[PDB]
Write a protein that binds this ligand. Structure first.
Ligand SMILES: CCCCCCCCCCCCCCCCCC(=O)OC[C@H](COP(=O)([O-])OCC(O)COP(=O)([O-])OC[C@@H](COC(=O)CCCCCCCCCCCCCCCCC)OC(=O)CCCCCCCCCCCCCCCCC)OC(=O)CCCCCCCCCCCCCCCCC
Ligand code: BCL
Ligand code: BCL
Ligand code: BCL
Ligand SMILES: CC[C@H]1c2cc3[nH]c4c(c3C)C(=O)[C@H](C(=O)OC)c4c3nc(cc4[nH]c(cc(n2)[C@@H]1C)c(C(C)=O)c4C)[C@@H](C)[C@@H]3CCC(=O)OC/C=C(\C)CCC[C@H](C)CCC[C@H](C)CCCC(C)C
Ligand SMILES: CC[C@H]1c2cc3[nH]c4c(c3C)C(=O)[C@H](C(=O)OC)c4c3nc(cc4[nH]c(cc(n2)[C@@H]1C)c(C(C)=O)c4C)[C@@H](C)[C@@H]3CCC(=O)OC/C=C(\C)CCC[C@H](C)CCC[C@H](C)CCCC(C)C
Ligand SMILES: COC1=C(OC)C(=O)C(C/C=C(\C)CC/C=C(\C)CC/C=C(\C)CC/C=C(\C)CC/C=C(\C)CC/C=C(\C)CC/C=C(\C)CC/C=C(\C)CC/C=C(\C)CCC=C(C)C)=C(C)C1=O
Ligand SMILES: COC(C)(C)C/C=C/C(C)=C/C=C/C(C)=C/C=C/C(C)=C/C=C\C=C(C)\C=C\C=C(/C)CC/C=C(\C)CCC=C(C)C
Ligand SMILES: COC1=C(OC)C(=O)C(C/C=C(/C)CCC=C(C)C)=C(C)C1=O
Ligand SMILES: CCCCCCCCCCCC[N+](C)(C)[O-]
Ligand SMILES: CCCCCCCCCCCC[N+](C)(C)[O-]
Ligand SMILES: CCCCCCCCCCCC[N+](C)(C)[O-]
Ligand SMILES: CCCCCCCCCCCC[N+](C)(C)[O-]
Ligand SMILES: CCCCCCCCCCCC[N+](C)(C)[O-]
Ligand SMILES: [Fe+3]
Lengths: 281, 302, 240
C-alpha cells in the first residue's frame, strides 16, 4: 500500500477545511474534505445518469444520453425526464471537478509543492463551463449546451459547427488548433529528447542536458532548455484550451453568421478592395 | 503573491556555449547567433550554433524551392500585383492535377505540373530533414527517439500527399497548397467519406491529441511545481532519484492512485504524442481505399 | 474487413503498450510496502519489469532498476492510529529531522557534473565570466523572512554553468556564515529579496554545505526540502 519512499511524506497537515477530520488515505488515495465532496458529487451524478438511463430505456454505454432542456425552457428549470436531470448532473459534474481541483490543492500543501497542477486543471474546468454554463447563459438557453452521451455529444459538435458553415474559419479556433498541434509536436520532442539522452547508443554512458541543448542547437539552431520546455508545454496546452473556450464563447453571441464571411473585412479594405485580378476580383 | 517560475527573475550569461563535441564534425557548426534577452525570460537566451552539413543544405534548399514554387504560383494568380497578393494571400491555392491525369506526370504546368514539382521539393526536404534528426543524434551518441517520433508525423503527411493518392490512382486526391484551400480540402474529405466522426481511428487520434494536451499540462505543471527541488534536471533525477521526483510521483499517486517515474513519464509522453499521427494516418489511409463511408461502415461495425 | 482487422489489432496493441508503460513506471518505489517497511501483501496486477542498467558518466558507476529499495536514512515519524492509512506525526522537529514537506532523499553526496565532468553548479564569483545579464541583480540586497525581519544579505548567485541559469542565492547570516536559498523560493524586489517560506529565525537551521564552492546532490536535497518545509512548519510565524 505505500511506495518504498512514501512514508516520510505522509504527515498531518495541509487541509483547507476540517482540520484533521478527513486527513487520511484509502490505499494510495488521499481523502481530505474535498475527497469526500468529490465522492458525493460523483456518486450523485452517476446515480442520476443511471436514473436518466432508466427513463430513456437503455443500459447501453453507446446509447445512454442525457440531454439538456429543449430551447423553449430558456434558462428555467425543466421536468427531470425532460432536461432537469441534465441540469442536476451538470451541478454535480461542476462540484466534482472543482472539488477534485481543491483536493489537489490540499495534496500540494501537504507535499510542499507549487500549485501549478490544479491551476492548470482549472483551465479544463473553465472550458467545460464555457460549453455548459457561460455560453448557454449568454445565448439564453440551457439547450445550447451539449448532451452527455458518447455519440450524442459528437452529434452536438457536428451540428453546432455546421450552424456557422465550415467552423475551420473561426479565427480563435485556428489559433486553438495551432496550439494543440504545436503542443503535441513539443510533447513528442520532449519525450524523445529526454529518452534519447537517458537511453543512448548501446554501451554508452547516459548523456547530459548539455547534450540535449547540443542536439537541438545542431538540429534547428536553438534549444529552449530544460526549464523552458516544461514552461512551454504548460503554456501551449493551456493556450490551446484558453483559445478553445474563447472560440466558443464568441460563437452564437458576438458572431453568429457564417465564419467564412468574417474574413471579408480584410478583402474589403478600401486600398485594395476594387483592384481587379486575383481570387476576389 | 509567491514566485511561480513561469518567467525568470534574473538572467545570467557566460561564455557562448559551443556544445558537446562527441563525434560531431565541428567544421560544420556555425558560430553562435545573437543572445536574446527577450527569449531568456522564458527559455535560453542563446541562439546557435546550428549544424550545417551537406544534407542540411539539401533540405533547406529543397524546402525553400517548395516554398518559392507555391509563392511564384501565388504571384501569378495575383496577376503580379503586390496589393492583390496581400489581399488574396489566404485564398490562393496550388492544386494537384485533375483526376483525368491519374498518376502521370503529364499534366501541364498551370494545371498540376507545378503542384508535382512543389511536392517533389517537399518530399526531399522532409526526408532529408528526417535523415538529419537521425544523424545529429548518432553523432552525439544519443538514442534515435527523435527520428522515430518524427517518422510518426511523416507517416500522416506521406499518407495524405503520397501513399493514399497512389492507392486511389490519382494525384487529384492529394492536398492543395493553400491556407484556406487546405481547410476546404479537410472539410470536403470528411463530407465525402460519410463524416470522420464515424472513423474509429479519427476518434482515437482525437483522444491522443486531447490526451497530449492533458499530459503536457500535467507534466509541465508537475515539473514547475517541483522546480524548487530541482525537478527539471530530469536526467540526474533518473540516475539518482531526489525529493523532486518523489513528491511529483506522490502528488499523482495520492490524486489518482498511480504515478510515473522521472524516466517513465517521458515514455507516456512520447507515445501519447506519436499515437496522434499513427492512428490518424491509418484512419486516412483506409478512407476511400477500403472504406468509402465511415457512417455506413460503422452500421455494420465492419 | 481490413478496417475491422486494423481496429481490433490496434486495441490489442494498445493494451500491450499500456502494460509496457505501466511496468516501465514501476522501476522506482516498488515493491509496495506496509507502513512498517515490510513488503505489502497486495502488489497489484502488474509485475516488476526485468532490470535495466544506466551507465553513468565520469566514473560514477551504474544504476540498475528495479533494485533493492531503502531509504538509507532514519525517518523520525510515528503512527497516530492503530490501523493503516492515517498520518504519521513527527517525533521531533520535522524541519530539523527532514520529514513531511521538509523531506530530503539520500542522494549521492557528490555534485552533479556537466558534460565535461566539471561541477554543474558554482558560485558566480568562481564562474568565468558569468554575470547577471537582465533583471534586478539580487547581490547585495537584504533578505527578509515571512516574519518580516531581515535574516541576512545576498552575497552571490550560484549558477548552473551548462544551462546558464540562476539556481541559488547565497545568503550571509548575522554570524558571517552563509546558506543557499533555492532561486524558485525567493522574490527579488527593488529593495530586498523576500522569502515567504522561512521566518528569519529559521535561516540558521538551513542545512550547510561542506565545501564553500560546490554543493552535492545530497546537500541540495536537504536545503530545498528544508526551505519548502517552512511553508507548512513556519505558518505560525507568518503573517499577513
Ligand atoms: C502502421 C504504421 C506505420 C508505422 C510508422 C511509424 C512508426 C513510428 C514508431 C514510433 C516509435 C517511437 C518509440 C521509440 C522507442 O522507444 O524505440 C526505440 C528503439 C531503440 O532505441 P534507440 O533510440 O535506437 O536507442 C536507445 C536504446 O538503445 C534503447 O531505447 P529504448 O529503451 O527507449 O527502447 C526500447 C524498445 C525496444 O525497441 C524496439 O524495437 C521497439 C520498437 C517498436 C514499435 C512498435 C510499433 C507499433 C505501432 C502500432 C502497430 C499496431 C498495429 C495496429 O522498447 C519499446 O519501445 C517497445 C514497446 C512496447 C510496445 C509493445 C506492445 C504491444 C504489443 C502487443 C500485444 C501483446 C499483448 C496484448 C494483450 O528503436 C527501434 O529499434 C524500433 C524502431 C522502429 C523503426 C523501424 C525501422 C526498421 C529498421
Ligand atoms: C464539424 C465540426 C467542426 C468543429 C466544430 C467545433 C465545435 C462545436 C467545438 C470545437 C472545439 C474544438 N475544436 Mg473544432 N471543429 C471542426 C474541426 C476541428 C479540427 C480539424 C482537424 O478539422 C480540429 C483540430 C479541431 C479542434 C478544436 C479544438 C480547438 C476544440 C476541442 C478541444 C477543447 O475544447 O478542449 C477543451 C476541453 C474540455 C471541454 C474537457 C473538459 C473536461 C474536464 C473539466 C473534466 C472531465 C473529466 C471527467 C468526466 C472524468 C471521467 C472519470 C474517469 C475516472 C476519467 N476542430 C469541424 C470544422 N470544434 C470545441 C471547443 O472549443 O470547445 C471549447 C467546440 O465546442
Ligand atoms: C472537447 C470539445 C468537445 C468534445 C469533442 C469530442 C470529439 C470530436 C471527440 C471526443 C471524444 C471523446 N470525448 Mg468529448 N468533447 C467534449 C467534452 C467532453 C467531456 C467533458 C467536457 O466532460 C468529456 C468527459 C469527454 C469525453 C470524451 C471521450 C468519450 C472521448 C475521448 C476523449 C479523450 O480521450 O480525451 C482526452 C483525455 C484522456 C485521454 C483521459 C481519459 C478520459 C476519458 C477516456 C474519460 C471518458 C469519460 C466518459 C466515458 C464519461 C463518463 C463519466 C462517468 C459517468 C464518470 N468529452 C466537448 C463537447 N470529444 C472522441 C470520441 O471518440 O468520442 C466518441 C472524439 O472523436
Ligand atoms: C470538417 C472537418 C472534419 C475533420 C476532418 C479531418 C481530416 C481530413 C483529418 C483530420 C485529422 C485530425 N483531426 Mg479531424 N475533422 C473533424 C473534427 C475534428 C475535431 C473536433 C470536431 O473537435 C477535432 C479535435 C479533430 C482532430 C483531428 C486530429 C486528431 C487529427 C490531426 C492530427 C494532427 O496532429 O495533424 C497535424 C499533423 C500533421 C498533418 C503532420 C505534419 C507532418 C510534417 C512532415 C510537416 C512538414 C511541414 C513542413 C515541410 C513545413 C515547414 C514549415 C515550418 C515553418 C518550417 N478533428 C471534422 C469531422 N480531421 C487528420 C487525421 O489524421 O484524421 C484521421 C486528417 O487528415
Ligand atoms: C487544460 C489542458 C488539458 C487538461 C489539463 C488537466 N486535466 C486534468 C488535470 C489537468 C492539469 C488534472 O490535474 C486532472 C487529473 O487528475 O488528471 C489525471 C485532470 C483531469 N482531466 C480529466 C479528463 C479530461 N481532460 C480533458 C482535457 C484537458 N485537460 C485539456 C486539454 C478531457 C478532454 C479533452 O475531453 C478529458 C476527458 C480527468 C482524467 C481528470 C479529472 C478527473 C476528475 O475531475 O474527477 C472528479 C470527477 C469524477 C471522478 C467523475 C464525475 C462524474 C460526473 C459527476 C458525471 C459525469 C458528467 C459528465 C459531464 C458526462 C460526460 C459524458 C461524455 C461522453 C461527454
Ligand atoms: C508526432 C505528432 C506531431 C509531430 C512530431 C514531430 N514533428 C517533427 C519532429 C517530430 C518528433 C521533429 O523531429 C521535426 C523537427 O525537426 O522538429 C523541430 C518535426 C517537424 N515538424 C514540423 C512542422 C509541423 N509538424 C506538424 C505537427 C506534428 N509533428 C504532430 C502534431 C505540423 C502540423 C500540425 O501541421 C507542422 C506544420 C517542422 C517544424 C519539423 C520538420 C522540418 C522539415 O521537414 O523541414 C523541411 C523544410 C525545410 C528544411 C525548410 C523549409 C522552408 C520554410 C517553408 C520557410 C523558410 C524558413 C527557413 C527555415 C529560413 C532559412 C533562411 C536561410 C537562408 C537563412
Ligand atoms: C515527473 O513527474 C511526474 C510523475 O511522477 C514522477 C507522474 O506521476 C505524473 C502523472 C502521469 C502519469 C502517471 C502518466 C499516465 C497519465 C495519463 C495518461 C493521464 C490520464 C489519466 C487517467 C486516464 C487516469 C484517470 C484516473 C483518475 C482520475 C482516478 C479515478 C479515481 C476515482 C475512483 C474517483 C472517485 C473519488 C476519489 C478517489 C476521491 C478520493 C475519495 C475517496 C477515496 C473516498 C506526471 C504528469 C509527472 O510529471
Ligand atoms: C513574398 O513572396 C515570396 C518571395 C516571399 C514567396 C512567398 C511564398 C508564399 C506566399 C508561399 C505560401 C505557401 C503556403 C500557403 C503553403 C501551405 C501548405 C499547406 C497548408 C500544406 C498542407 C498539406 C500538405 C501535404 C499533406 C503535402 C504532402 C506532400 C507529399 C507527401 C509529397 C508527395 C510527393 C509527390 C506527389 C511527388 C512525386 C515525386 C516522386 C517520384 C518521389
Ligand atoms: C530536455 O529539454 C528540452 C529542451 O531543452 C534541452 C529543449 O530545448 C527542447 C527543444 C525545444 C523546442 C524548440 C521545441 C520544438 C517545438 C516547436 C515550437 C517547433 C526539448 C524538446 C526538450 O525536451
Ligand atoms: C454518459 C455516458 C455513459 C457512460 C458509460 C460508461 C463508459 C463506458 C465506456 C464505453 C465502453 C464501450 N464498450 C467497452 C462497452 O464497448
Ligand atoms: C525553430 C527555431 C528557429 C531557430 C532560429 C535559427 C537561429 C540560428 C542562428 C545561427 C546563425 C548565426 N550566424 C548568423 C552567426 O551564423
Ligand atoms: C480509463 C479510465 C480507467 C480508470 C482507472 C484508473 C487507473 C487507476 C489505477 C489505480 C488503482 C488503485 N488501487 C491501488 C486501489 O487499485
Ligand atoms: C500513451 C498511451 C495513452 C493511453 C491513453 C488511452 C486513451 C484511449 C482513449 C479511450 C477512448 C477511445 N475512443 C473513445 C477515443 O475511441
Ligand atoms: C491512460 C491509460 C490508463 C491508465 C490507468 C492504468 C494504470 C494504473 C495501474 C497502476 C496500478 C498502481 N499499482 C497497483 C501498480 O500500484
Ligand atoms: Fe520532462
Amino acid at each position: 500500500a505505500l511506495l518504498s519512499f512514501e512514508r516520510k511524506y505522509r504527515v498531518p497537515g495541509g487541509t483547507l477545511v476540517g482540520g484533521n477530520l478527513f486527513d487520511f488515505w484509502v490505499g494510495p488515495f488521499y481523502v481530505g474534505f474535498f475527497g469526500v465532496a468529490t465522492f458525493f458529487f460523483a456518486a450523485l451524478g452517476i446515480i442520476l445518469i443511471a436514473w436518466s438511463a432508466v427513463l430513456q430505456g437503455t443500459w447501453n454505454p453507446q446509447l445512454i444520453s442525457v440531454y439538456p432542456p429543449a430551447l423553449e425552457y430558456g434558462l428555467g428549470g425543466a421536468p427531470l425526464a425532460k432536461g432537469g436531470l441534465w441540469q442536476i448532473i451538470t451541478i454535480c459534474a461542476t462540484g466534482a471537478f472543482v472539488s477534485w481541483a481543491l483536493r489537489e490543492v490540499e495534496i500540494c500543501r501537504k507535499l510542499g509543492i507549487g500549485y501549478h497542477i490544479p491551476f492548470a486543471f482549472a483551465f479544463a474546468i473553465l472550458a467545460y463551463l464555457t460549453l455548459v454554463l457561460f455560453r448557454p447563459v449568454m445565448m439564453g438557453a440551457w439547450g445550447y449546451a451539449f448532451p452527455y452521451g458518447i455519440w450524442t455529444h459528437l452529434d452536438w459538435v457536428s451540428n453546432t459547427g455546421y450552424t456557422y458553415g465550415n467552423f475551420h474559419y473561426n479565427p480563435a479556433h485556428m489559433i486553438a488548433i495551432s496550439f494543440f498541434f504545436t503542443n503535441a509536436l513539443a510533447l513528442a520532442l520532449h519525450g524523445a529528447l529526454v529518452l534519447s539522452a537517458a537511453n543512448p547508443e548501446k554501451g554508452k554512458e547516459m548523456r547530459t542536458p548539455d547534450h540535449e541543448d547540443t542536439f537541438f542547437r545542431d538540429l534547428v539552431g536553438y534549444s529552449i532548455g530544460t526549464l523552458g520546455i516544461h514552461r512551454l508545454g504548460l503554456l501551449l496546452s493551456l493556450s490551446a484550451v484558453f483559445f478553445s473556450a474563447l472560440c466558443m464563447i464568441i460563437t452564437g453571441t458576438i458572431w453568429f453568421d457564417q465564419w467564412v464571411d468574417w474574413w471579408q473585412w480584410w478583402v474589403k479594405l478600401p486600398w485594395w478592395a476594387n483592384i481587379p485580378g486575383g481570387i476576389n476580383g | 503573491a509567491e514566485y511561480q517560475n513561469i518567467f525568470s527573475q534574473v538572467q545570467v550569461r557566460g561564455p557562448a556555449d559551443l556544445g558537446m563535441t562527441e563525434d560531431v564534425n565541428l567544421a560544420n557548426r556555425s558560430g553562435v547567433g545573437p543572445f536574446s534577452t527577450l527569449l531568456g525570460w522564458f527559455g535560453n537566451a542563446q541562439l546557435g550554433p546550428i549544424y550545417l552539413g551537406s544534407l542540411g543544405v539539401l533540405s533547406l534548399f529543397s524546402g525553400l524551392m517548395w516554398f518559392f514554387t507555391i509563392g511564384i504560383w501565388f504571384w501569378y494568380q495575383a496577376g503580379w500585383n503586390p496589393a492583390v497578393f496581400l489581399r488574396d494571400l489566404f485564398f490562393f491555392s496550388l492544386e494537384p492535377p485533375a483526376p483525368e491525369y491519374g498518376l502521370s506526370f503529364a499534366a501541364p504546368l498551370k494545371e498540376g505540373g507545378l503542384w508535382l514539382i512543389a511536392s517533389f521539393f517537399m518530399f526531399v526536404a522532409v526526408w532529408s530533414w528526417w535523415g538529419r534528426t537521425y544523424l545529429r543524434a548518432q553523432a552525439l551518441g544519443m538514442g534515435k527517439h527523435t527520428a522515430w517520433a518524427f517518422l510518426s508525423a511523416i507517416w500522416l503527411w506521406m499518407v495524405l500527399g503520397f501513399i493514399r493518392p497512389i492507392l486511389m490512382g490519382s494525384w487529384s486526391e492529394a492536398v492543395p497548397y493553400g491556407i484556406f484551400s487546405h481547410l476546404d480540402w479537410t472539410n470536403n474529405f470528411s463530407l465525402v467519406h460519410g463524416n470522420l466522426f464515424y472513423n474509429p481511428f479519427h476518434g482515437l487520434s482525437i483522444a491522443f491529441l486531447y490526451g497530449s494536451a492533458l499530459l503536457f499540462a500535467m507534466h509541465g505543471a508537475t515539473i514547475l511545481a517541483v522546480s524548487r527541488f530541482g525537478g527539471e534536471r530530469e536526467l540526474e533525477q533518473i540516475a539518482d532519484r531526489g525529493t523532486a521526483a518523489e513528491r511529483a510521483a506522490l502528488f499523482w499517486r495520492w490524486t489518482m492512485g498511480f504515478n510515473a517515474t522521472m524516466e517513465g513519464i517521458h515514455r507516456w509522453a512520447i507515445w501519447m504524442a506519436v499515437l496522434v499521427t499513427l492512428t490518424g494516418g491509418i484512419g486516412i489511409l483506409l478512407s476511400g481505399t477500403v472504406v468509402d463511408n465511415w457512417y455506413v461502415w460503422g452500421q455494420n461495425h465492419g | 474487413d481490413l478496417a475491422s482487422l486494423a481496429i481490433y489489432s490496434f486495441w490489442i496493441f494498445l493494451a500491450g503498450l499500456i502494460y509496457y508503460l505501466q511496468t516501465e513506471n514501476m522501476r522506482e518505489g516498488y515493491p509496495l510496502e506496509n507502513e512498517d517497511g515490510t513488503p505489502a501483501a497486495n502488489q497489484g496486477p502488474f509485475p516488476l519489469p526485468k532490470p535495466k542498467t544506466f551507465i553513468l558518466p565520469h566514473g560514477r558507476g551504474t544504476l540498475t532498476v528495479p533494485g533493492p529499495e531503502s531509504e538509507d536514512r532514519p525517518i523520525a515519524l510515528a503512527r497516530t492510529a492503530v490501523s493503516e492509512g492515517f498520518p504519521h506525526a513527527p517525533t521531533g522537529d520535522p524541519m530539523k529531522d527532514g520529514v513531511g514537506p521538509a523531506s530530503w532523499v539520500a542522494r549521492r553526496d557528490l555534485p552533479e557534473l556537466d558534460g565535461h565532468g566539471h561541477n554543474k553548479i558554482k558560485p558566480m564569483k568562481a564562474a568565468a565570466g558569468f554575470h547577471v545579464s537582465a533583471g534586478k541583480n539580487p547581490i547585495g540586497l537584504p533578505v527578509r523572512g515571512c516574519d518580516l525581519e531581515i535574516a541576512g544579505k545576498v552575497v552571490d548567485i550560484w549558477v548552473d554553468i551548462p544551462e546558464q541559469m540562476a539556481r541559488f542565492l547565497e545568503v550571509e547570516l548575522k554570524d558571517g556564515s552563509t546558506r543557499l536559498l533555492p532561486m524558485q523560493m525567493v522574490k527579488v524586489q527593488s529593495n530586498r529579496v523576500h522569502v515567504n517560506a522561512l521566518s528569519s529565525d529559521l535561516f540558521a537551521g538551513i542545512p550547510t554545505i561542506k565545501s564553500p564552492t560546490e554543493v552535492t546532490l545530497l546537500e541540495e536535497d536537504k536545503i530545498c526540502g528544508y526551505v519548502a518545509g517552512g511553508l507548512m512548519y513556519a505558518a505560525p510565524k507568518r503573517k499577513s
